UniProtKB/Swiss-Prot annotation, chain B:
Role according to the record: Subunit of the fusion protein that is processed upon entry into the host cell. Mediates fusion of the virion and cellular membranes by functioning as a class I viral fusion protein. Contains a viral fusion peptide that is unmasked after S2 cleavage. This cleavage can occur at the cell membrane by host TMPRSS2 or during endocytosis by host CSTL. In either case, this triggers an extensive and irreversible conformational change that leads to fusion of the viral envelope with the cellular cytoplasmic membrane, releasing viral genomic RNA into the host cell cytoplasm.
Entire-sequence positions represented here: 939 to 1146 of 1273
Disulphide bridges: 94-105, 144-188
Result, substituting residue 180 to H: In strain: Alpha/B.1.1.7
Name of the protein this chain belongs to: Spike protein S2'
Phenotype when changing residue 16 to H: In strain: Omicron/BA.1, Omicron/BA.2, Omicron/BA.2.12.1, Omicron/BA.2.75, Omicron/BA.4, Omicron/BA.5, Omicron/BQ.1.1, Omicron/XBB.1.5, Omicron/EG.5.1
Residue positions the entry lists as glycosylated: 136, 160, 196
Coiled coil: 11-55
Segments for region (Heptad repeat 1): 1-32
Gene: S
Amino acid sequence: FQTRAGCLIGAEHVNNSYECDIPIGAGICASYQSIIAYTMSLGAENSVAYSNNSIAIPTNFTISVTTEILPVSMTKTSVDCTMY
Amino acid sequence: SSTASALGKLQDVVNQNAQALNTLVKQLSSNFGAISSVLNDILSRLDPPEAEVQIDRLITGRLQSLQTYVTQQLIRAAEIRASANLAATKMSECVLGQSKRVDFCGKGYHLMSFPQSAPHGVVFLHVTYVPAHEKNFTTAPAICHDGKAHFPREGVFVSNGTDWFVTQRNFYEPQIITTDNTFVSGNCDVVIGIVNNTVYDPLQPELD
Amino acid sequence: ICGDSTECSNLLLQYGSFCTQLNRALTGIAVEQDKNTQEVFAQVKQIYKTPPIKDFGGFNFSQILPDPSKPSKRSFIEDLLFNKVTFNGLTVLPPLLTDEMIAQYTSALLAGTITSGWTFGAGAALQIPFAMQMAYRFNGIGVTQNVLYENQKLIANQFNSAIGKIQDSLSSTASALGKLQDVVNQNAQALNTLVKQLSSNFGAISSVLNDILSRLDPPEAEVQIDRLITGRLQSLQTYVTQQLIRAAEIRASANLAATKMSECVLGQS
Ligand SMILES: *[C@@H]1O[C@H](CO)[C@@H](O[C@@H]2O[C@H](CO)[C@@H](O)[C@H](O)[C@H]2NC(C)=O)[C@H](O)[C@H]1NC(C)=O
Ligand SMILES: *[C@@H]1O[C@H](CO)[C@@H](O[C@@H]2O[C@H](CO)[C@@H](O)[C@H](O)[C@H]2NC(C)=O)[C@H](O)[C@H]1NC(C)=O
Ligand SMILES: *[C@@H]1O[C@H](CO)[C@@H](O[C@@H]2O[C@H](CO)[C@@H](O)[C@H](O)[C@H]2NC(C)=O)[C@H](O)[C@H]1NC(C)=O
Ligand SMILES: *[C@@H]1O[C@H](CO)[C@@H](O[C@@H]2O[C@H](CO)[C@@H](O)[C@H](O)[C@H]2NC(C)=O)[C@H](O)[C@H]1NC(C)=O
Ligand SMILES: *[C@@H]1O[C@H](CO)[C@@H](O[C@@H]2O[C@H](CO)[C@@H](O)[C@H](O)[C@H]2NC(C)=O)[C@H](O)[C@H]1NC(C)=O
Ligand SMILES: *[C@@H]1O[C@H](CO)[C@@H](O[C@@H]2O[C@H](CO)[C@@H](O)[C@H](O)[C@H]2NC(C)=O)[C@H](O)[C@H]1NC(C)=O
Ligand SMILES: *[C@@H]1O[C@H](CO)[C@@H](O)[C@H](O)[C@H]1NC(C)=O
């Protein structure tokens, strides 16, 4: 297969489109089924029902708990010249 | 408990530091163009007036490697300091108070957060509110009554086909329209979208 | 450094691993660039679309929405912006996201914020007439919604005039995009000086390896080879360090842009 990133051997080009897991480049990437290369999809598409006299209001709710992890420090090291 | 690789960032930091140390210590086994890699051999094979050149080559090579290592350490330390400042701001704003800036801590409307200690970092648990189960309704921006225009004090006008209640903007809770949750401004001739209806008041029924 | 010379390769082989060390930095730079773009633009999950009929209370967004007639699917202002701006062992890799995908992300964000207000940034998009969203924002800045409804046409006209004026100013006056041009010029100049450094004696008798090999005996030519090797390696190291500094500053700017997109677009700040 020939693409803007280069030439790819060992994969089959398809006409579908799914999420991207192994990014190849130029907007294409590959996944395992065999191995298939395809054009990545940016997500599901919906058309919100706009009108000039209509709204939507929620009736229920949920409570969610999420995580985020941050590094704050690294190991303290020292080096002596003459020994090194 | 089960899923692994959930702490990729800390592992990446540790791996970077360990690999930098490993390559630094492995660089001690390079000739750098000299006749050997150990000082004792060149000392015990050649007379010093000619071995000093090889010693100089080893010295300059090792010094250059040390310089590169120190520069890389400085870069990484600067980045880590940036991350630590971000973490301090998050811990001050999302743990000691309820934050209003959208998406700063949590994907939704922020409620609270809890910290947990990690080997070289911190973990925040964010509690957020998410609406669900929405419904369609018809809407009007004002109500014309007795020639005047009424706007909601806080909420929005809706109707389930008829009856035109007022609600709050984030949770369906219809209520009858009274002169207590609305205010008047001008006549109903300039606004684009007003609808005819009635606005009840309690003083008249209380009168009799 | 060597340029297809076995003698140079053998001589360089006895410096240990400086080259895996160098490539491990450029790879990180490239991955960071891709992550920057992804975290700035991929703020949504679904691709929203504007309705075929466009009656936003008199506001006129036609200059900003995509034009299907144009093959690029970009908008007027995007086209103005794109037109306004301007092999020796070196490779340039394409970005993961092509320009059409970035345009699609921007279009999705913009249609979502036009139709659903700020609700689409928390949960699922909920529709709302545009004038009501304006009334909500006026209430947000401490002005009663009375004022908007009583002055809708004037506000719409002022907005349209402002957008026309900004389009005209961007179209006519140049030098308004100095920052991106500066970034491009800095990168190009760095590559240019790196490739020009290839023609320096560095204390040797010549700047080309073939003449060194084809004019002397290897036991004495290896000295000149060594001088050239160390000089070129020094230049490469300096280039890599400069690249690292520039990448750090670009990452800082990208983080600021991501926060601005999250706060001032998905909500009212
Ligand atoms: C709200 O009203 C709309 C208008 O009828 C309902 O129908 C959807 O309209 C949009 C826009 O035309 C379409 O994309 C959807 O496919 C329609 N729904 C269906 C089931 O066909 C809509 O279902 C109503 N409810 C909500 C939550 O939007
Ligand atoms: C709001 O959502 C919650 C959770 O989805 C609903 O609670 C569920 O109600 C069903 C039917 O009564 C039960 O079978 C589930 O066990 C309940 N779940 C929980 C966690 O208690 C609740 O009924 C919903 N309320 C409204 C008004 O829609
Ligand atoms: C809209 O909601 C209102 C408030 O619940 C409804 O008014 C009452 O609805 C109940 C349920 O059928 C009736 O038994 C009452 O007689 C209604 N009260 C009045 C004063 O009419 C109303 O029926 C709802 N309308 C629609 C179309 O759903
Ligand atoms: C909201 O949208 C409706 C479209 O349903 C508009 O109603 C149209 O108004 C024009 C001019 O008055 C008429 O020529 C059309 O026949 C109407 N459409 C229908 C289906 O009747 C309405 O004007 C818009 N604005 C408001 C404030 O309601
Ligand atoms: C709300 O009620 C008023 C009067 O109760 C309506 O105003 C009338 O409108 C018709 C049609 O435009 C005119 O022929 C009458 O002369 C008007 N009367 C008055 C006293 O103004 C008004 O049209 C109603 N609102 C709607 C949307 O129909
Ligand atoms: C929104 O503004 C655009 C201009 O930016 C309007 O399009 C122009 O309309 C006039 C009137 O016919 C034409 O002479 C121009 O050639 C149009 N410009 C372009 C680029 O097509 C557009 O009509 C406005 N929207 C509405 C609903 O009126
Ligand atoms: C499907 O893809 C193949 C190559 O992968 C191509 O030859 C063919 O035309 C495509 N068909 C459709 C309907 O897209």
